[PDB]
């Protein structure tokens, strides 16, 4: 069992899933409305969104309080966030600007990937070695979508039997997608293209928000019960409360290097020869050059205007 990193509005916490009865440790305190959270393990970085400050920040683990603002403008409700630990990128969703965007880890070179046909985008998850990103939208037409990490080839993968898809996560070892629906009261799983869908957990989910996974176990936060719960990812059996009496549990991850599998960065040492952004791509050579928003990529496919 892993450490679980979770956002908690006024702070970010870490609880040992193996001992959820003890006090959680406060990794970062003095926050206003911390919602989304992720990390880059090899870099010793933890990122979070704050929906009242309208910002994304980061710190260095156990070398705090060296906290920095990384995205400060053009955000209103940054409800979801994911770190590309391979391409070294930051992705996020905003349910009020209706946008999915990407930037470097330091916030530079920001690029709007999608800004249309988004209503209530929420959770976002990345498969950097496959060049895909996945997100949920709990709006008027609820759905789960995926697209290239370079913003290519957007497609809807789930759009039936869905209402409030709040949590989303990936199993890198088994190539499976998992999500939590807070209105329909279940957790489901499917192939990464959404096919071969199956029920996992079918009750006791009054208000799941965020979902993660480690080894044979799913972990999630529930807004109603103010706790973290777990079950078996194959059978949905062994439903149990891991950690209780949480002030306001939010986004959550299994905090482990093993949850960010190593691979070769297709961008290589020289940023793939891109002048600005080198983004993971699902198509060979598995990276794609890109430019900050508004600026056009030239004919050579590598240099921005």
């Amino acid at each position, epitope marked *: 069992a892993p450490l679980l990193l979770y956002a908690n509005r*006024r702070d970010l916490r870490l609880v040992d899933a193996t001992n959820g009865k003890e006090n959680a440790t406060i990794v970062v305190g003095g926050l*206003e*409305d911390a*919602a989304a959270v992720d990390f880059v393990f090899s870099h010793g970085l933890i990122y979070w969104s704050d*929906v*009242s400050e309208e910002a994304i920040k980061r710190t260095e683990f156990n070398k705090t309080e060296s906290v920095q603002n990384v995205v400060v403008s053009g955000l209103l*409700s940054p*409800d979801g966030l994911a770190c590309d630990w391979l391409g070294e990128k930051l992705y996020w969703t905003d*349910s009020e600007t209706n946008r999915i965007e990407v930037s470097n880890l330091d916030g530079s070179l920001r690029k709007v990937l999608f800004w249309q046909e988004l209503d209530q985008p929420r959770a976002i998850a990345l498969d950097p070695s496959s060049g895909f990103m996945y997100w949920t939208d*709990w709006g008027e037409v609820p759905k789960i979508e995926r697209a290239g990490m370079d913003g290519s080839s957007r497609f809807i993968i789930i759009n039936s039997e869905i209402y*409030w898809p*709040n949590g989303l996560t990936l199993d890198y070892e088994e190539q499976k997608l998992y999500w939590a629906d*807070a*209105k329909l*009261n279940f957790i489901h799983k499917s192939n990464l293209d959404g096919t071969n869908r199956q029920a996992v957990v079918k009750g006791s989910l*009054p*208000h799941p928000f965020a979902l993660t996974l480690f080894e044979d176990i799913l972990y999630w936060t529930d807004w*109603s019960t103010h706790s973290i719960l777990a079950c078996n990812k194959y059978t949905g059996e062994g439903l149990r409360e891991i950690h209780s009496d949480i*002030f*306001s549990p*939010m986004d959550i991850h299994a905090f482990s290097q093993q949850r960010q599998p190593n691979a070769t960065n297709p961008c290589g040492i020289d940023n793939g020869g891109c002048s600005h952004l080198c983004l993971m791509s699902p198509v060979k050579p598995f990276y794609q050059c890109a430019c900050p928003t508004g600026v056009k990529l030239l004919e050579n496919g590598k240099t921005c205007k």
Partner: antibody, heavy 126, light 108 residues
């Protein structure tokens, strides 16, 4: 426009029960918190509890926990306050009020009460 | 429970006067504070939430400020129709709790 209409208030003997209703219209019932708040004659406002009709989850004030419960019939867009073992001190005007914003939103205004019913008077007396 | 303490519990001021009502929380509730106006025999009406956000349709003379534990309601220019009891409330966590209220009378 948003509307909340309370009914069922009345004279009731101590130790008795009474069910109040809150009929809602003009907004999506299942997207909201619905609160009950009471005010004794000449006194302040006291939150009694809330329900989120989508699944029927509730929270209650310590003062009424064990005696009062809240339920909702989404087919009728109506919430109910079931009051048991009534005491003289329960005498008050009971309001139902809607929380602001969407129950599923991250920026949560669910405890900000933006629309209130007219209230219904409950008198616990012999 | 978070105790919300208003002061003063009542006041009288003249039309055109600037009036200040304070609300103090026993814990840090960030900016999760709302203000309501209650006229006699009527339900409370929301004036302000998130400490400083003026609710649609509410007169500009009403404003709220504050953060953490100390919050203020200001009426910049008191009007005769402002006779009421005003309540602060934390919307920060369960249970929602209200201040004891401040009765405002018009001095003429």
């Amino acid at each position: 426009e948003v509307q909340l209409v309370e009914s069922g208030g009345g004279l009731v003997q101590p130790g008795g029960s009474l069910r109040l209703s809150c009929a809602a219209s003009g907004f999506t019932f299942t997207n909201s918190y619905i609160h009950w708040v009471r005010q004794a004659p000449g006194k302040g406002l006291e939150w009694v509890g809330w329900i989120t009709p989508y699944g029927g989850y509730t929270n209650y004030a310590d003062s009424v926990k064990g005696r009062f419960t809240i339920s909702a019939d989404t087919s009728k867009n109506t919430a109910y306050l079931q009051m048991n073992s009534l005491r003289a001190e329960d005498t008050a005007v009971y309001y139902c009020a809607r929380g602001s914003g969407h129950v599923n939103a991250v920026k949560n205004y669910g405890y900000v009460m933006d629309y209130w019913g007219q209230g219904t008077l409950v008198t616990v007396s012999s | 429970d978070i105790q919300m303490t208003q002061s003063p519990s009542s006041l009288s001021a003249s039309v055109g006067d600037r009036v200040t009502i304070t609300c103090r929380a026993s814990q840090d509730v960030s900016t999760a504070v709302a203000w309501y106006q209650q006229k006699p025999g009527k339900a409370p009406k929301l004036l302000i939430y998130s400490a400083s956000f003026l609710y649609s349709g509410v007169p500009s003379r009403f404003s709220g400020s504050g953060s953490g534990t100390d919050f203020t309601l200001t009426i910049s220019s008191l009007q005769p129709e402002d006779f009421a009891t005003y309540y602060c409330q934390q919307s920060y966590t369960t249970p929602p709790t209200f201040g004891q209220g401040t009765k405002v009378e018009i001095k003429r």
